[PDB]
Design an enzyme around this catalytic site. Structure first.
Site, PDB file in Angstrom:
ATOM      1  N   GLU A  69      -5.552  -4.339  -7.111  1.00  0.00           N
ATOM      2  CA  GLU A  69      -5.870  -4.107  -5.704  1.00  0.00           C
ATOM      3  C   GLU A  69      -5.387  -2.721  -5.326  1.00  0.00           C
ATOM      4  O   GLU A  69      -4.670  -2.125  -6.070  1.00  0.00           O
ATOM      5  CB  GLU A  69      -5.123  -5.083  -4.847  1.00  0.00           C
ATOM      6  CG  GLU A  69      -5.500  -6.516  -5.101  1.00  0.00           C
ATOM      7  CD  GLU A  69      -6.808  -6.908  -4.454  1.00  0.00           C
ATOM      8  OE1 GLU A  69      -7.081  -8.134  -4.423  1.00  0.00           O
ATOM      9  OE2 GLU A  69      -7.554  -6.020  -3.994  1.00  0.00           O
TER      10      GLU A  69
ATOM     11  N   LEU B 290       0.765   3.110   0.549  1.00  0.00           N
ATOM     12  CA  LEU B 290       0.616   1.789   1.133  1.00  0.00           C
ATOM     13  C   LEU B 290      -0.484   1.695   2.087  1.00  0.00           C
ATOM     14  O   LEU B 290      -0.690   2.573   2.912  1.00  0.00           O
ATOM     15  CB  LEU B 290       1.887   1.350   1.902  1.00  0.00           C
ATOM     16  CG  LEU B 290       3.147   1.359   1.166  1.00  0.00           C
ATOM     17  CD1 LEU B 290       4.360   1.298   2.080  1.00  0.00           C
ATOM     18  CD2 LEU B 290       3.198   0.220   0.183  1.00  0.00           C
ATOM     19  N   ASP B 291      -1.186   0.535   2.054  1.00  0.00           N
ATOM     20  CA  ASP B 291      -2.133   0.161   3.075  1.00  0.00           C
ATOM     21  C   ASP B 291      -1.328  -0.033   4.335  1.00  0.00           C
ATOM     22  O   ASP B 291      -0.277  -0.602   4.273  1.00  0.00           O
ATOM     23  CB  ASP B 291      -2.746  -1.196   2.690  1.00  0.00           C
ATOM     24  CG  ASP B 291      -3.977  -1.524   3.459  1.00  0.00           C
ATOM     25  OD1 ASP B 291      -4.002  -1.606   4.670  1.00  0.00           O
ATOM     26  OD2 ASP B 291      -5.012  -1.686   2.823  1.00  0.00           O
ATOM     27  N   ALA B 292      -1.849   0.388   5.462  1.00  0.00           N
ATOM     28  CA  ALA B 292      -1.106   0.200   6.738  1.00  0.00           C
ATOM     29  C   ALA B 292      -1.104  -1.234   7.226  1.00  0.00           C
ATOM     30  O   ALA B 292      -0.394  -1.560   8.143  1.00  0.00           O
ATOM     31  CB  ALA B 292      -1.739   1.078   7.801  1.00  0.00           C
ATOM     32  N   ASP B 293      -1.898  -2.078   6.586  1.00  0.00           N
ATOM     33  CA  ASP B 293      -1.913  -3.482   6.918  1.00  0.00           C
ATOM     34  C   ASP B 293      -0.857  -4.139   6.101  1.00  0.00           C
ATOM     35  O   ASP B 293      -1.145  -4.830   5.133  1.00  0.00           O
ATOM     36  CB  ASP B 293      -3.326  -4.053   6.614  1.00  0.00           C
ATOM     37  CG  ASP B 293      -3.496  -5.491   7.016  1.00  0.00           C
ATOM     38  OD1 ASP B 293      -2.680  -6.002   7.722  1.00  0.00           O
ATOM     39  OD2 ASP B 293      -4.459  -6.152   6.586  1.00  0.00           O
TER      40      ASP B 293
ATOM     41  N   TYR C 245      -1.636  -1.539  13.128  1.00  0.00           N
ATOM     42  CA  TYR C 245      -1.354  -0.676  11.991  1.00  0.00           C
ATOM     43  C   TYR C 245      -0.366   0.425  12.302  1.00  0.00           C
ATOM     44  O   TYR C 245       0.540   0.657  11.487  1.00  0.00           O
ATOM     45  CB  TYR C 245      -2.640  -0.092  11.413  1.00  0.00           C
ATOM     46  CG  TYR C 245      -3.538  -1.118  10.755  1.00  0.00           C
ATOM     47  CD1 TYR C 245      -3.208  -2.466  10.723  1.00  0.00           C
ATOM     48  CD2 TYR C 245      -4.685  -0.732  10.124  1.00  0.00           C
ATOM     49  CE1 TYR C 245      -4.045  -3.404  10.115  1.00  0.00           C
ATOM     50  CE2 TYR C 245      -5.542  -1.664   9.530  1.00  0.00           C
ATOM     51  CZ  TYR C 245      -5.225  -2.975   9.548  1.00  0.00           C
ATOM     52  OH  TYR C 245      -6.024  -3.882   8.944  1.00  0.00           O
TER      53      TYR C 245
END
EC number: 2.4.1.-
Length: 295
Positions: free
Chosen positions: A226, A194-197, A50
């Site tokens: 989502e 943003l999701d770090a994934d 991540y």
């Protein structure tokens, strides 16, 4: 003007989010001791790289601020490690949740319950159950607010509640934190959360979003909102304030349909004249250079 998108009877202008619009990633760490005392306390394994995802995004988006919004009981060495990340990548800005004041969005739980009791004295079984149980809720830590209660969980609710509030502050969160080298942010501006994934493969450029907002949607016969991408062009976006008014008016959380989602749908289609699928098509954040949940 930059075009429009119509939904449920209203024409929403497509609004730009330019390079002034920062990216934001969140890392709220319940168990910071699982990291080295002088390491960056963000997961960076082969399986979940991540930190690397965030660094790559900062490099690619060389003309943009990249925020890392964090909370947890970090050690001094961990804070210093975050500091070193900021020196090494000049567009990365670390924002501690500790440093931000959310009192303008807070409410005492007693106020919420009283309002509920007052309304609920004025048609159904649901209501009478609601009334008793809310009444019960009041009787019970009388200074407690939405913030103080969420401050007690160290789980998803803590993360989600603070993500949502951050998004209300938008670019202002960087200004409020006093981050260096944030002179290009627009005061009252938005953010691309943003999701770090995720993997960014190339520059985003300017995004054009309906009423300046869009969200991650996952699509086999099914479709869902989502929470891995939320983009807004301005602070206190009205669709997000709608979610906040809901949280401010309701006694109880709904786990699957969170207040951010509920607020979005209520703002854009309070009546539900279009189906969920149509709403998903409308709000969807789509960019060919982002690949979500790579891990």
């Amino acid at each position: 003007s930059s075009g429009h998108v119509s939904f449920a009877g209203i024409d929403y202008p497509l609004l730009p989010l330019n390079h002034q619009t920062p990216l934001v990633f969140q890392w709220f760490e319940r168990n910071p001791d699982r990291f080295g005392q002088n390491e960056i306390p963000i997961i960076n394994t082969q399986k979940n790289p991540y930190l690397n995802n965030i660094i790559n995004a900062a490099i690619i988006e060389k003309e943009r601020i990249i925020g890392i919004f964090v909370d947890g009981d970090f050690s001094k060495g961990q804070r210093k490690a975050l500091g070193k990340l900021e020196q090494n990548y000049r567009n990365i800005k670390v924002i501690y949740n500790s440093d931000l004041n959310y009192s303008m969005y807070d409410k005492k739980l007693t106020t919420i319950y009283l309002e509920n009791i007052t309304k609920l004295e004025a048609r159904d079984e649901v209501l009478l159950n609601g009334v008793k149980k809310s009444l019960e809720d009041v009787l019970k830590n009388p200074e407690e607010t939405l913030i103080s209660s969420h401050n007690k969980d160290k789980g998803h609710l803590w993360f989600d509640f603070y993500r949502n509030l951050f998004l209300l502050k938008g670019s202002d969160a960087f200004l409020e934190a006093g981050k260096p080298g944030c002179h290009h942010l627009q005061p009252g501006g938005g953010c691309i959360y943003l999701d770090a994934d995720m993997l960014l493969t190339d520059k985003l450029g300017t995004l054009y979003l309906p009423d300046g907002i869009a969200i991650h949607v996952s699509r086999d016969n099914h479709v869902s909102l989502e929470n891995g991408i939320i983009a807004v062009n301005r602070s206190e976006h009205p669709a997000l304030i709608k979610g906040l008014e809901i949280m401010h008016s309701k006694p109880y959380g709904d786990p699957y349909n969170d207040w951010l989602s509920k607020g979005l749908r209520h703002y854009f289609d309070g009546s539900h004249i279009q189906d969920y699928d149509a709403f998903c098509d409308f709000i969807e954040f789509k960019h060919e250079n982002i690949i979500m949940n790579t891990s």
